[PDB]
Structures are given as C-alpha cells and as structure tokens.
C-alpha cells in the first residue's frame, strides 16, 4: 500500500471535535480541545500538579511522562522526563523537561531530541542542550545541536534551525555530490536567501576536485507586474585544467550568465528574454548545467517587447547567437527586428491582414555583408464553407526592399555579386479546398464512425532571381505532413522559391461511440508543374528531378487505450531517391511512476548532404545521418523504490548515444537517490572516435518535516535525450 498511507499509520489523528466549558473526572483522572490524564492530580486556586503515568493530548501534540504541572489561566505547562508526538504531523522525540509557553505557541525541550521517524524506526535524530518548536514561524531552533544517524553524531554546531512546515526560510539547503570523469569528485552546498514573497536567490559553491577551486553559482528568481524570470551567474576565478589546454592565455576564469523572462502585462504588453552567454566555447562540455547542454552548438541571446490587441500587434526584438564551433566564425544577428501585424475581418465578404517587418543584419566578422531589409505583405482572402467542406482563396503581395553594405570583400571572392539596393515584388495566389465524408462502422464495434478528409491546394508564386541578395535568415524547411500545405519552402524572407504546384492529401479518423477520436492516419504529396527556383539553387541532390510528385509525407496516431499510444511519421523525397526522415514511438503510461516508451528516429545520409553544412558529408561524426533506437522506463518496486532508466543507441555505429539509470529509495523519514549517466561528450580529432563522459550523482533528503513527498519524473529529464510524454 502507498507510502503516504504507510507514513500516516505512524502519525496520530485527532479523535475529538475542534473548538470555554471545563470538566474534571476521577475515582473521587481525566480532564477536558486539550485533555489531561493521570493517576493523581492536585488542584490549587489557578494550578495543578499531575503524577503517575501523565498523558496530555491536544490539537497539535501528545505529551507523556512521570510528572505534570500547569497554570490554568495562561495554559502554561511543564512535563518532566517525558516524550512527545506531533498530531497531524510526523515529528516525535524525548526531553528531560518539556514546556508549553506563550499560550501553546512555543514548545521548549531541555536536553531535547527530535526526529520525523516513526516510533522505534529511529534512523536519524537531532539532539540539543535546548530545542524550541515555534508553531507560528514553522521552525525548530536547537542550541548545541548534534545531528545523529543511528547513535553516532555526524555534525555539531552551537546553534541550528530546522524548518518544520512549508513556509520559506533563509539558510543552507541539504548538499549534494557527484563523481564525474570530467571533474572527479564534485560537491554542491546551496544557501537559500528568501528576499521577499516575490523574489529569492540561491548561492551555491560548487567544488570540483580536478580544478582545485570553487565555482560560485548564483541564482536569482523574481515575480513582477512585468512577468516572472530567473537569472543565473556561475563564476570560477581560475581553472587549472583550462590553464594547461590554453596555457599562453591571460586568465583561466570560466563563467556563465543566463537570464530568462516571460510576461504579459495589462493584457497588451508582452515581454520576453532568452539570454545565455559563456566565457568560452568549451563551457557546456566541461560544466553540467541546468540551461545549456553539451548537445548545443551555440548560445541564444534574445530580447523582445511587444504590444498586442485583438486586431493589431507590434514587436521589437534582437536576436544574437554565440557560436561555439571553430569551423566558421561568422554569425548573423538581427539588431533590431520590428514585426507588425494588422487584421480586419468582414471587409465585404473578404478578410484582410497586413504583415510588415523592418530588420537590420549585423555580423561578428568585419568583412561580411550587412543589410537593412523592409518587407510589406498585404493579404486578402475569401473563405467559403459548408457542413461537408470548404474552400479558401488568398492573394498576397510580397514586397521587399534591401539596402546592402560592406560588399567589397564578398564581391572579390564570388562571380555572382551582391547589389547595394534590391527590390523584390511577387504576387502570391493560393486556393485550398477540403471535404469531409463520414461512414458508419459495422465491423469494429457498435456506434463507431470513420471520417475521410481529402484536401487539395494550388499555389502560384512567380520566379524572381534572388542571387544578388545574401542569405541572412532563410533555412530550408522540413516538409512534414502539415508542412505539405505551407506557402514557403524557406524559413525567412531572403529566399522565396517559385511555386507552381498542387498539394493533395487525405486524412482518415476513427471515432468511438462517445465521439472520441481513437485513431488517425494522413498521407499526402506535392506535385510540381515547374521547377521551384530561387536563382541561388546551390542545394545538392541524388537526382536531377525538378517536376512531378517529388515530396511525400505521412503521419499516424493511434490512442489504443487511455494507457497506450502509438505515433509515427515518414518523409520521402524522390530527389534523395530515399526516405528523407522518419520517426515513431510507442508508449505505455499508467501513472507518473509507471511508464515504458520505445522510440525510433531516422534521417538519411542524403538528407544531411542536401540540407546541412557541406562538411557534414565529409566529417564522420555527421556523414551517416541518424538511425537511433531509444527506450525509456520508470517503474516502482515495492511502494518505496523508484527505478528510472533510458538507453539510446546508434544503429549505424553500433554504439550507445546516451545511457541513464536512476534509483531512488523513499522512506517516511528520508529519501536517497543515486543517478548514473553516460553520454557522448565530444570527438577525439587525433584518433577519430567519440568521447564519453560518465557521471554518478548522490542526492539525499529528509522527509516528514514538510509536504515534500518517488523522484520518477525529475530523473526522466536529467539526461541529454530527455523524456517527452507521447500518449
């Protein structure tokens, strides 16, 4: 039976109604929320002595011992040589003199001891020359404190506090440790600073044995009218490992700054920050971190401010990137970008929208082109609809102006040359029609229904030669099944590909007798009537194919029960002669505690060659694409162990990508977690193979002092390929 119930079996309930009138009962002793029982009582007028097997109980504590005393006007009390047990809360212990003062607020213990462990289960205890439990500040204060595990003291101090509730308090948190191949032994000691209800900090020294020095990790969190955010500043004054690999340099400091903010204010002002900066490219490969990862090739630096109302929005933003690889030192930034949208429905039968952008492009390299771009995009559409189908028609103008600067260096290297002033105007036309057929299922079960949903879309965009515009912001988009119906081949405004194509596709859905969707499957293709061109069509493919049915995609989802889910998708491109990418996953999930997921990811070698930097087709670490099998599981053993684990495997290499294993044992009195991870953490250029990092991490916690109560869902996201719930 569940752990909260096992722990509650050791915790007194309250047997009486919550609440003055007074009652005394005796042979010629039981007295009455607060109750006193004894063999003998002597009363004076107001005070009592009590003697023999003295027992006292109350809305928050049981007390027991040889002798009692009280003042009945103030409810001040003394029990000598006693023991105590909290009511509706887990704590208990002993004292040579136990005292109630300040009308039940303060419970004092001379030569006291305290634990959250249930009776006889004596794992750990505090001992002190004095203890005070204060019910209003939710705190135990201890003088000459010794902390014992079993009978032996682990620690001493002249003074100590435990928080014994859920109200926040400043001071040290319980430390943690790990052993890593990267830093050897590591230790973390958080101090928590409770600044205000709406803001706090944590200061955490992080010792690393290999480096011989402490990194100082500083976290600050805030909540404000403008939103909520977090700042992290991690700083290491010098690094004896770095100072051997980079020995000529001026200083071996390492640092990370992170800031994240999001908020919407007065329903109209939108604020966002997503900012990371680090001292060097190697930072996330050396230092395990909450925000970056060894999986990341750059740090993102973004700010935005927006005004939004129901029919209009305007956003100003910057977008800067710090790129870690030495392989290209160029990086474009938007400094700033302004976006504007305006909406107007029912303009006669038509709905209208205008998109406007102004952006300045800056590069880290002194010799790269710079530009300003201005874009304006009026759109008019005519939506028509029925019970059984619809058709949408749109027209747009794609008007753009560039001013380009710093061209002398680039025009020295290339035969196609950039132009200082470029206008591009393009009309776009789109027609997009849908139907919905229904059918009663005689075969699967009573009351089930199948839907069949054909779509077709025509798109025309004319050719403009764009080879005099440098590509600052246009990546090639991935053509998934919903992606068959995009009006864009590229992600920005620097490449707009000509279009003359019909996309066709079909979805089918199965609905049960409660009208819940149980299953769907989608298939579609793009048929191109003319070659889709930009004039900078320097992409490389297996085939010279240009027209016809070039792109296929499909997608399915089966909700097999409220516990089982199957997802998968495939992209096939005839210009690769091959499946471009695929993924699938099956999941079973009964609880947060109980899940198994299998997943597969494929991306072909031809897809890498067609869509990623040209050296990826030569570098053995990128060249082969992706063929990755993954298994993720969480299960409880008894009601007290959680076992969590992930394994990810490269099926071309026959080598592990990632492996994680987490075990948490969870008592009523404490919990312990061990976590292991082994990950791909770089490449050895001199030997031409992958590098692995191992980490073993030890976390320990007290329980019964707070509402905090099997560790599963945190472990499942600790690794480089973290769990996403696919039901």
């Amino acid at each position: 039976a569940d752990l909260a119930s096992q722990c509650m079996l050791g915790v007194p309930s309250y047997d009486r109604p919550l609440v003055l009138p007074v009652t005394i009962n005796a042979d010629h002793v039981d007295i009455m929320n607060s109750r006193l029982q004894a063999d003998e009582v002597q009363l004076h007028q107001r005070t009592v002595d009590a003697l023999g097997n003295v027992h006292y109980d109350d809305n928050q504590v049981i007390l027991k011992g040889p002798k009692g005393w009280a003042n009945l006007n103030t409810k001040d009390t003394n029990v000598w040589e006693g023991d105590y047990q909290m009511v509706g809360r887990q704590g208990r212990g002993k004292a040579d003199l136990m005292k109630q003062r300040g009308e039940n607020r303060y419970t004092i213990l001379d030569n006291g001891s305290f634990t959250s462990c249930l009776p006889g289960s004596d794992t750990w205890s505090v001992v002190g020359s004095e203890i005070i439990h204060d019910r209003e500040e939710q705190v135990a204060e201890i003088w000459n404190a010794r902390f014992k595990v079993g009978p032996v003291p682990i620690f001493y101090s002249p003074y100590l506090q435990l928080p014994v509730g859920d109200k926040r308090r400043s001071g040290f948190l319980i430390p943690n440790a790990k052993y890593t191949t990267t830093n050897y032994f590591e230790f973390y000691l958080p101090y928590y600073w409770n600044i205000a209800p709406n803001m706090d900090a944590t200061i955490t020294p992080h010792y690393m044995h290999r480096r011989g020095n402490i990194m100082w990790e500083n976290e600050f969190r805030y909540l404000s009218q403008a939103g909520a955010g977090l700042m992290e500043l991690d700083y290491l004054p010098s690094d004896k490992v770095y100072e051997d690999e980079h020995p000529n340099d001026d200083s071996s400091r390492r640092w990370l700054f992170y800031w994240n903010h999001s908020g919407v204010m007065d329903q109209v002002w939108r604020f966002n920050v997503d900012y990371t900066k680090v001292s060097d490219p190697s930072y996330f490969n050396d230092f395990d971190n909450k925000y970056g990862s060894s999986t990341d090739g750059y740090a993102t630096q973004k700010f935005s401010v927006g005004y939004a109302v129901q029919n209009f929005n305007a956003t100003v933003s910057t977008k800067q990137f710090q790129v870690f690889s030495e392989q290209n030192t160029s990086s474009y930034s938007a400094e700033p970008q302004l976006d504007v949208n305006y909406y107007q429905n029912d303009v006669g039968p038509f709905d209208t929208r205008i998109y406007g952008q102004a952006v300045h492009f800056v590069n880290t390299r002194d010799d790269m082109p710079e530009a300003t771009r201005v874009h304006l995009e009026p759109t008019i559409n005519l939506p028509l609809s029925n019970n059984w189908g619809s058709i949408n028609t749109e027209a747009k103008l794609l008007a753009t102006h560039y001013q380009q600067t710093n061209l002398d260096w680039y025009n020295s290297r290339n035969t196609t040359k950039l132009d200082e002033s470029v206008n591009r105007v393009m009309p776009q036309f789109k027609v997009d029609g849908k139907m919905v057929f229904e059918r009663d299922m005689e075969m699967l079960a009573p009351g089930y229904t199948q839907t069949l949903e054909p779509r077709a879309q025509y798109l025309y965009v004319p050719y403009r030669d764009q080879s005099d515009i440098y590509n600052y912001d246009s990546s090639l988009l991935q053509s998934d099944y919903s992606g068959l119906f995009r009006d864009r081949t590229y992600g920005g405004l620097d490449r707009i590909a000509s279009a003359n194509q019909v996309t066709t596709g079909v979805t089918s859905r199965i609905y049960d007798d409660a009208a819940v969707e149980r299953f769907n499957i989608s298939v579609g293709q793009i048929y191109y009537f003319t070659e889709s061109r930009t004039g900078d069509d320097n992409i490389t493919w297996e085939n010279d194919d240009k027209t016809g049915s070039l792109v296929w995609a499909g997608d399915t989802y089966w909700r097999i029960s409220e516990r089982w889910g199957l997802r998968g998708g495939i992209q096939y491109d005839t210009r690769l002669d091959n499946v471009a990418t695929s993924n699938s996953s099956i999941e079973y999930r009964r609880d947060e505690d109980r899940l198994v997921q299998l997943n597969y990811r494929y991306a072909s070698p031809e897809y890498i060659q067609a869509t990623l930097p040209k050296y990826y087709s030569t570098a053995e670490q990128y060249k082969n694409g992706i063929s990755q099998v993954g298994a993720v599981a969480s299960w409880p053993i008894a009601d007290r162990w959680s076992i969590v684990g992930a394994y990810y495997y490269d099926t071309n290499a026959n080598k592990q990508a990632d492996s994680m294993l987490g075990v948490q044992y969870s008592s009523c009195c404490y919990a312990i977690r061990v976590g292991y991870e082994r990950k791909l953490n770089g490449w050895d250029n001199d030997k031409q193979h992958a590098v692995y990092d191992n980490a073993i991490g030890f976390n320990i916690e007290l329980r019964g002092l707070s509402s905090n109560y099997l560790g599963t869902q945190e472990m499942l996201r600790s690794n480089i390929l973290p769990y996403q719930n696919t039901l």
């Binding site: 928080p163 926040r168 400043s170 948190l173 709406n198």
Partner: peptide, 11 residues
C-alpha cells in the same frame, strides 16, 4: 537550514 518554495505576490 533553509527552505525554498513558489514565488507569490505580497500579501
């Protein structure tokens, strides 16, 4: 010893 929790507006 100290104890962390969710942020909230005063009061």
């Amino acid at each position: 010893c100290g104890l962390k929790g969710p942020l909230y507006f005063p009061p």
